[PDB]
Copies of this chain bind each other. A is one copy, B any other.
Amino acid sequence: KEVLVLWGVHHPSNIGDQRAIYHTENAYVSVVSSHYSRRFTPEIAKRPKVRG
Q: Which B residues touch A43, using CB under 8 A?
A: 30, 37, 39
CB closest chain-B residue, reference A47: B32
User: Can you show 7 pairs from A to B with CB atoms below 8 A apart?
Assistant: A32-B45, A32-B46, A32-B47, A32-B48, A33-B47, A37-B45, A39-B45
Chain B nearest CB from A43 CB (Å) reads 5
Contacts from A to B (Cβ < 8 Å): 30, 32-34, 37, 39, 43, 45-48, 50
Chain B nearest CB from A13 CB (Å) reads 10
CB closest chain-B residue, reference A30: B45
Whole-angstrom distance between the alpha carbons of A47 and B34 in the complex?
A: 7
Q: Which B residues touch A30, using CB under 8 A?
A: 43, 45
